[PDB]
Amino acid sequence: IKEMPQPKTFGELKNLPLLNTDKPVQALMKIADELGEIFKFEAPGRVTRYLSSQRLIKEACDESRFDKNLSQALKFVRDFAGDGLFTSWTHEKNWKKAHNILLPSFSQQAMKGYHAMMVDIAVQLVQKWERLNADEHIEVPEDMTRLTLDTIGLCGFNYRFNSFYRDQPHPFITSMVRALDEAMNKLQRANPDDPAYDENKRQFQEDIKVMNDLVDKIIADRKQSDDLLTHMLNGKDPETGEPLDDENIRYQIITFLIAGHETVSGWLSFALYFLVKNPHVLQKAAEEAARVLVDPVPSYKQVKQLKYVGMVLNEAIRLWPTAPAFSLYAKEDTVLGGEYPLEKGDELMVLIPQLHRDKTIWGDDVEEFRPERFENPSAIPQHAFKPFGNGQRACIGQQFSLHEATLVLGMMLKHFDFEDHTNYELDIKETLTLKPEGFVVKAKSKKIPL
Amino acid sequence: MVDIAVQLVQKWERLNADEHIEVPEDMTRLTLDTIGLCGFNYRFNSFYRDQPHPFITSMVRALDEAMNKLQRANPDDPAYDENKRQFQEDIKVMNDLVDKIIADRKASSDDLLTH
Amino acid sequence: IKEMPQPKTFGELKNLPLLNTDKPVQALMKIADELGEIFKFEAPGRVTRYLSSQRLIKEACDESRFDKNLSQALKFVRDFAGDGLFTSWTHEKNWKKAHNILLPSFSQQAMKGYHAMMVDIAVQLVQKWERLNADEHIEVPEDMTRLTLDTIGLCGFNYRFNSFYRDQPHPFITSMVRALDEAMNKLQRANPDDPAYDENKRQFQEDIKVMNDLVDKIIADRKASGQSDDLLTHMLNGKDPETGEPLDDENIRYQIITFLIAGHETVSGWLSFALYFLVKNPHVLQKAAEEAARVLVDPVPSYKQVKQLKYVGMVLNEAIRLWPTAPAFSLYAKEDTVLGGEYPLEKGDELMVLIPQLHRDKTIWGDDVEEFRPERFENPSAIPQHAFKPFGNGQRACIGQQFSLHEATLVLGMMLKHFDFEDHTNYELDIKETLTLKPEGFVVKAKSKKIPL
Amino acid sequence: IKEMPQPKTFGELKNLPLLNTDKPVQALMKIADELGEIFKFEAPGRVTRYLSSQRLIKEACDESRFDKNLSQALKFVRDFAGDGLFTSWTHEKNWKKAHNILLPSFSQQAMKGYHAMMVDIAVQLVQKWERLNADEHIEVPEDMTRLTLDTIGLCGFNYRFNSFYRDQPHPFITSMVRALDEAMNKLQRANPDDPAYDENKRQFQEDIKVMNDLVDKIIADRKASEQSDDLLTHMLNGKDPETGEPLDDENIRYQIITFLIAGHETVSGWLSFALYFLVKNPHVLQKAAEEAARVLVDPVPSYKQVKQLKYVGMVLNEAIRLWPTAPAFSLYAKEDTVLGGEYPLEKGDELMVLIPQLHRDKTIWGDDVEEFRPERFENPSAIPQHAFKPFGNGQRACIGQQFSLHEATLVLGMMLKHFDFEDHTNYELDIKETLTLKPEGFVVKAKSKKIPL
Ligand code: FDE
């Protein structure tokens, strides 16, 4: 039962200066590489422990001892998402209520309903790229969020953002980035009440009104369908017989627009990066897509058969998990790993990109992109691969993402050949999530019609 | 009372043609200004404000807290630390406003506060 | 005498660094104090000469030799005021057309029509100040912009901004301040295409959208739903004698913006400075409150009574002499000429009149040019021509001079009748500069004289 | 019985944002004008109460209940002034020790010895101005630091700084202003250990080494042969009457720094202000030059002649009244006490005397506190006790008080004898704040009266 490592302190500022970058998650990974499986991290008022090894995280994922915690990041995001599924505490009224009301919308059969609409937007993406003249290129992260925002909008709410009819980023997304960017910058503000932050605070509200105005436009377009929005309005709580409060329903819409398109958007962009940097892996998935997608538009069953594309997807999110961390707190007093005592209420952070690079589980080539590690999904021991959270607070849209990413990635491989014409150097922008910045490619159409 | 009521009428007469009226927000503007003037000779000037008076926001959040504590199973859950904080933040603002009313009289009547 | 004075130069940046302050006009007032009646001012790409003495200003006011120029300041205001009266060239189409169409709206026959609506806005201010609690104070420039904006909206467009029902400045006022502040800061950018200014370049546009969204709201309440005889009917219905046609809807919108801005912003500064000199010169305040008690004998002021507030008008004039809230106007050389017999000008050379400096000429105003003595205006005829130019010059002079002076006189009259004013902080005059001038933190406390309305 | 006023608060930062300007003392003077005779000012770890009225300052100057305190400003200057006379606690061994040995260096008999050296520096200033060409001007605070620094150098240590042979300031003054400004800016830092201030910490230390490299130059040039009878002789050889010992090598090092800084910086500010009031108040300037022409009848003035320039001293007294170049001094409560019968104080609580605010108490000086009226100082006996405190209080009052006034009169006497001064720029007073006060960018022109030396 020994003492815990800790990085450099700056007097009364503690460890806060060490995350004084636009890339805090990558700075924590360096500290993890420098200090190991666990280290203590102090801020003016907060203290947290970062876990990097599967040995300690395996006990942290035990729901008998640990419960989902709202990190200082989520408490700031709660300023515009409120008590929706992502930023809710487990033991507060609306998490249980809404979790059970929304869960039918993510069943395997609900996915069959989404498929036609997912195919709608994916065809729009293929048609955008097929109409590029020979000199033009593609901005990967921008066209992916065009697609992922449109999917969550059409399937969830029957609302058309028409992102492909906008050369500019969609206004909802542009202020959302600023709101998520603001939240992350507040984690680095020592004294958030300095007058210097008065422009920053007023812009922050300006961006929330933009997010709420769109939601009221989504609500006004309804009040003919059995989508996710019908379920928010109509589902009863079995114990009380009542539907979700209107203020919560606005909160869940925001949550799904954000969590339901950004992490999928980063995902697809990373998968395209690793393919275009590993050209043999790209032709093996291109062979599978040419084999399985035999129709002008894909069917639901065909997506289920793109086994190798799926492994590409799992190996990308292993290397770069687009939601990079989740937080826990100590239900009751306990000792961690038989060496580290924790009092009730002590907080842990699972550093997901560090868990997925644990040499002791994945072998001594953790940093290489090898999709063939997931040819045997069962081989990997429990709690070693945690890109979607843990337990009852794990990602509810866990199958929706996989189907959307697989379908979209499948059709791109069927219809285009991709050249990394600039020799792109991977640069990971951090909002609270991860995405490659300025990643561009060229796509020669294989001239297969739709 | 007529003082406050005339202020409300004049607010509605000066709206432009396309605008509308949110009734409970303008009613709280009227009734609160009335208790302030009649009770304490104190002018909240609620109709000279766009958003609610800060006393009104802290009061409703305090009343909302009181009602929500009734439905709460496990009152020490970490989910409620913000609530305990915010509750105490809302107590100080209501007392501060009462400190402003009491002190504003030590300057200066035969109203409720005089009794 | 032949060579022209010029301040310190900074390499390929010329004189531009000299204006790196939040207060550029007062910084120019100090260069003139050091260099005299005229000096050359170079920035990367532009050159202008600043005039300060009545001797040269009288020559520049010769309309046969000089015409109104769009200073670099106004060219940037033209990005949202467009082709309106203020930012229009004399010889381009929509100036003379709009001027002839709109001049009837500022005759003093129209002023009597506006008077009832101006009284409306003014009573709302009196009632705000009477309803403050004992400990409260007043923010002077903030409450003056509420009144001046509400007056131009109601009299000009039959529109109510309802600024006294709003805690914060009205949304138009907030974007407009940022648009003027963006303009003022653009005069200092060595490279306006630098990526550093992308948030500025985008923020600037967001604020243009807000002002035009209000202009759409005013026209939405008119050119559909209804019969007024205000400024806007004249914009929609007046015709041009040479062409027979009214103004294009695009220009009308530019004219609405210009009247919202130039018609309240300069006025709110006027009242704030006038009230500043009053609480700093209490005997001038006593004499003005005596005329106000005498003339304003009814519960509400009439048009005839305002025309009789003579000492108040001298205060207002002595205020605008010290701090002319639109602080400069620009001119250029129609043809080659020599100015003052020593400084030649090629055709097209630009001159800028430094109004606060011309108003501080000792050779004209005597030896107490900085004292606030309203009695210098006791016989308005005694002043030399081109000695007092707070409202511009020639045919491009301020079209709203009789409108502003009437508005400023009426409101200052009612405050003096209804309140006693305390400079409870010993306010030190700190004058914020957008493109207009107003004091920044001026506050007072006001004891009500308990006179009914 | 009364709660104490406090200005606007900013969350956990308390009042600290309010002084985030380049002019914190002038910002506190403003806060005093709104909040009155005493207000509490909170910072994250510290609390201080600012006094402005003679009513409360007379009690703070009571040495049985209050003793000199080190404000946060002096605690930072103690980082390079160390244990010297200014930054020591009165209960420290080195204070009474250094006071008793150095106090003789300022007895009247010494002034006669310094007088010859003082004249040397001043004659250099007169002839510097006599050698300016006609178009050139004079930088007032820049030449005054040249004089006072050279004077303390020659009178104190027999060391020639030769400032009039210098480009821009000496390396000591150049390094010292940065050290004093760093000290002033450390007062605004929410968290000092922040990495952003590493360039500042590096630069602050680099400037401390420069100043010591000069005291070491002075010490080495002295013990290299040594029968002087100056202040440095007393530091090295005099023994303390109470303890029989002389000063530490470490402490002699700290006093040399102490005397070079506070002993020229406040004198230079003083003289710049007096010259500002002279060129802005032309009636007092003629009376001062008519007396100086009267008394200074020799090629050089004698000690006896300077002691007779009564009106010149009155100007100096009225200058330092309005702008005490050392703007504040700090006190703490020996034991629990009640201040003003209204505000209770715990033992050790900190008070700040706001000297420019004390000198503007209309209840003591009359209703013309902003007027430069030297005749308040004609019969000093009328002046109520503790109303005029430009040199501190009690046993911790300014030790060089007579030294400074005599130097200031001598120089001010000679400038007036030899020159008429033109305020050719209409300089607008701008008060730069290091930890001391001086006018920034004050310039004049001086036509020589052509009187030989
Ligand atoms: C719609 C959708 C879509 C999606 C996607 C995704 C991707 C790609 C990735 C991801 C992730 C995730 N998630 Fe995700 N997602 C979603 C969602 C969600 C929600 C609602 C949540 C929360 C849940 C609960 O709690 O109930 C999540 C959730 C999630 C998580 C966890 C959180 C915490 O904090 O714990 C993670 C890690 N997600 N994700």
Ligand code: FDE
């Ligand atoms: C409504 C209104 C109001 C007003 C006011 C005023 C005041 C207080 C002051 C003033 C001023 C002036 N203006 Fe003034 N104002 C107005 C207006 C105007 C207009 C529209 C103009 C333009 C004209 C022409 O050109 O046509 C002006 C204008 C003006 C001027 C000139 C500018 C230039 O550049 O030239 C001046 C200086 N204004 N202002």
Ligand code: FDE
């Ligand atoms: C040499 C010299 C010169 C001078 C000058 C002067 C002038 C002009 C002004 C002045 C001032 C003064 N000071 Fe001055 N001075 C000097 C000095 C000094 C010293 C050493 C001191 C210390 C003392 C004790 O004891 O602490 C002083 C001191 C002094 C003071 C006090 C501080 C406190 O905190 O208490 C004051 C306020 N001074 N000052």
